Amino acid sequence: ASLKSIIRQGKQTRSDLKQLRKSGKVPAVVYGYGTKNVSVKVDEVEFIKVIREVGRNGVIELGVGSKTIKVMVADYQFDPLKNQITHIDFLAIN
């Protein structure tokens, strides 16, 4: 429940999104209680291992910059061909 994130900068183009997915990274956003919209980056391999040990519906304490937020998972877009996760939405709860 200790996953790490990296804040994306402004205005990702088309190229640097697919260049980000040819690494092991996946784009993401966080929103909800007490926060603002922050768009982030998560490793794919690390994200699967956290889900497979806390379940589909569990609490993740991930860190954005300095602070850490208790975060649940809202939805995710999946590519059924070539079977990789392509977007993940995060929801803060408190």
Binding site: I48, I51, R52, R56, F78, P80, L81
Partner: protein, 137 residues
């Protein structure tokens, strides 16, 4: 032998073929399934041959679903005719698949039986296929 009982227009334009699957690309009714990898038409004789070869291998065990129905009629003009004196009579009924679409779903059987039953069906369709599970996570 699948065909609709009544259609408003018997003579129709042919469907658009390029692109990706609009929807219906996750297994929902069963445990295992067969998804497509290239693009083709399926002409309602192929899914009769494929459903029979599906069924006799499983010895009437678990259930089998078909996610494809042939909705669109296509025509053909008779033998040795000049071009253009109207549009010919109907010939058969097709359904269009694009890469992603699930074709059959099976359930109620072990996994290695499901791989072999779907492999026998896949040699009767004109499209490259692939064996898939029920996705989670």
């Amino acid at each position: 032998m699948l065909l609709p009982k009544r259609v408003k227009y018997r003579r129709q334009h042919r469907p658009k073929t390029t692109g990706r699957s609009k929807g219906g690309n996750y297994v929902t009714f069963g445990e295992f399934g067969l998804q497509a990898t290239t693009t083709s038409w399926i002409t309602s004789r192929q899914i009769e041959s494929a459903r029979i070869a599906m069924t006799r291998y499983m010895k009437r065990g678990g259930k089998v679903w078909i996610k494809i129905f042939p909705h669109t009629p296509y025509t053909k003009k008779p033998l040795e005719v000049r071009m253009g004196a109207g549009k010919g009579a109907v010939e058969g009924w097709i359904a269009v698949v694009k890469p992603g679409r699930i074709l059959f779903e099976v359930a109620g059987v072990s996994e290695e039986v499901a791989r072999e039953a779907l492999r026998l069906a896949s040699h009767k369709l004109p499209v490259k296929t692939k064996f898939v599970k029920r996705e989670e996570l």
